[PDB]
Every structure is written in C-alpha cells, then in structure tokens.
Amino acid sequence: KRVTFGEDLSPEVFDESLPANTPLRKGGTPVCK
Amino acid sequence: LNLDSIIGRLLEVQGSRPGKNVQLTENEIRGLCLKSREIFLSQPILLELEAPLKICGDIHGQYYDLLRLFEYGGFPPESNYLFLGDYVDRGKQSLETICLLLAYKIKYPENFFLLRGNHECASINRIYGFYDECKRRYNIKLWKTFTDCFNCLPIAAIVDEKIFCCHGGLSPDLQSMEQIRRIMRPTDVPDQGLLCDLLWSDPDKDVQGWGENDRGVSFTFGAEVVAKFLHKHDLDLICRAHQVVEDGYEFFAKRQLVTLFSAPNYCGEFDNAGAMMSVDETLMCSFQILKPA
C-alpha cells in the first residue's frame, strides 16, 4: 500500500465579496486513476 | 451543551455577506474548550488515522475562507478532516474559526482531527492577534481557557502507516515514534526539544543535513534528512504546513515532503492560493486548490 499522486484538479475560484457557498467556479473533484 | 445550536449559528453566515461576526456566549465557548479538551486527552498524542481523509494547512483566523474550504471539500461528516494547526492569529476572526473546529471535534470525535500548530501556544498567540481578539470580544479569562485547551492538542498523526503529519517538520532528536508518545499532556511548547521542532522546523533546499533556522527557533533540514527518515520508519510521505506557499501546496525532496497552506490571500499581504490534500483509500493524494480571483 504505497503513496501515489492523482491528476491535477481545476481550482475552486472564489470572490472575497461573494458568499462562501457561492464560488465563481466550482473546483475539480478527485476521481479514480 | 447545545452543540447543534452552536454549529447552526456558526454555519448560518454561509450564504450571508462575508465579514460578519458570529458572537457566541462566554459559556458556550468555554463549554467547547472543556469538552474538546477531554477528547484530546482521551485520544493519542500521536494519532493513527485511516484513509479516506482530507488534510488542511494553516487557517489563521480566516473563518469565511474555512467555510469555502468546507464548501469545496464537503462539510462534516461528509468527509474526514485532519488539520495541521495554526487556527488563530493573523486573521480577523480567530474565534469563529477555532469554535467551529472544536465543535466539529466534539460532534465527530472519530472523523475530525486537529493537530497543534506553533500558534496554538500562549507565548505566540499573545502577540499575533488571538489575545487581542479575546480581550476585545470577550475577556482575558477566556483566552486562558483556550490556552489550557491548546496544551492538550495532539502533536502528530500517521495516515495508514505511510503519511507522517505534523505542523512544522522533523527533529534531530527524533529516532523513534515512542519519543512522541512519551510526551505528557497538558504541556506548553518549549523553546527547545522534540516538541519544539515538530511545530517550528522547516525544510531547506540549500542545507546539507541539519542547520539553524532563520526564525531563531528550532532547525532546518535538507532532502537527505527527509529520505533517511522515511526509509527508517517505512513511510512514503511527510505532510506539513507552517509555511505560506503561492500555489497552496509545494513539494520537497522529490515529492517525499509536501507543505500545505489553506489560507488564501494570507492576511492581505500575499496573493497566494489555499490548498488541501485529499487522500483516497488507495493513498492516492490529490490537491484541491482554493484560488482567489
């Protein structure tokens, strides 16, 4: 059981003036290899 | 202790205009400290955690960014969480930050974990904001209550016997994990020793072995030190925080060490993004980044 690294994920973009539950762009979610 | 009422009020500002405070009562916060302190002491000082899990770096009182991190990674108990310390100081809302994390710790004691950072120390948070925030919004007595709670925080964690987690880094005094387990709680952070290094030491590319740290506290360590440590304890990765990085995360010594920082636009003096390491059941580590516009 060794440590590996997944693919790069699109970052969740947010605005500081906007509510925490309403990001500008939803970020990527880790998926299977 | 009405934990659900506390969490509810803390999460209530999720869709509100950012910046507004959540003012809990003195007794509610004191209750959070007392119960969490009990759980911290009942659980090992060296945690043995299992994947899947999400690991976060410094938060530093940036409460609304913490909500954004949960908005991205999933609010508990949807996901497991391990924080590497530094929840207070520098930010404008250290109280809201630590209260939610302590509430989640009490609410989900087996799926939510908090490590001790160097800012979870009375001598440190006295200076960099937390004391002033307590004196302003509550009282000095409550600050001492937080101190008594911080002194019982676990120091390190190991994920599936492969990922070693701490706030700072390695120590020249660390030959066996037993030395960490032998550390008695409650305790303050000393100016020197194993406990000091685990919360203060940093990796350094230009250092062969161990060197002096420019902070004036603890040490620096090179890539060879990391490699020897992993091989000796059959580990694959060191996961730490303690240092602000532009992309929110940064590898060291050929992906044998990673630094996590989860506070984007760090106290209005940086344009850095925040990041978070997601570890699945196969110990495959992904990096979820919270990036400012």
Author numbering:
A (entry chain B): 391 to 423
B (entry chain A): 7 to 299
Excerpt from the publication:
In vivo, Ki-67 and RepoMan bind specifically to the β- and γ-isoforms, but not the α-isoform, of PP1. We confirmed this in vitro using ITC, which showed that the affinity of both Ki-67496-536 and RepoMan383-423 for PP1α7–330 is ~four–six-fold weaker than for PP1γ7–323. Deleting the last 15 residues of PP1γ had no impact on binding. The change of only a single amino acid, R20/Q20, switches PP1γ into a ‘PP1α’-like isoform (PP1γR20Q; KD = 2239 ± 124 nM; ten fold weaker binding) and PP1α into a ‘PP1γ’-like isoform (PP1αQ20R; KD = 199 ± 46 nM; similar binding to that of PP1γ). Although R20 does not interact with Ki-67 or RepoMan directly, it confers selectively through its interactions with PP1 which order the L1 loop. Namely, the Arg20 sidechain forms a salt bridge with PP1 residue Glu77 and makes a planar stacking interaction (cation/π interaction) with Phe81. Remarkably, the R20Q mutation abolishes PP1γ localization as effectively as mutating the canonical RVxF motif in RepoMan to RATA.
While PP1 exhibits broad specificity, it acts in a highly specific manner by forming stable complexes, known as holoenzymes, with a host of regulatory proteins that direct PP1 activity towards specific substrates and localize PP1 to specific regions of the cell.
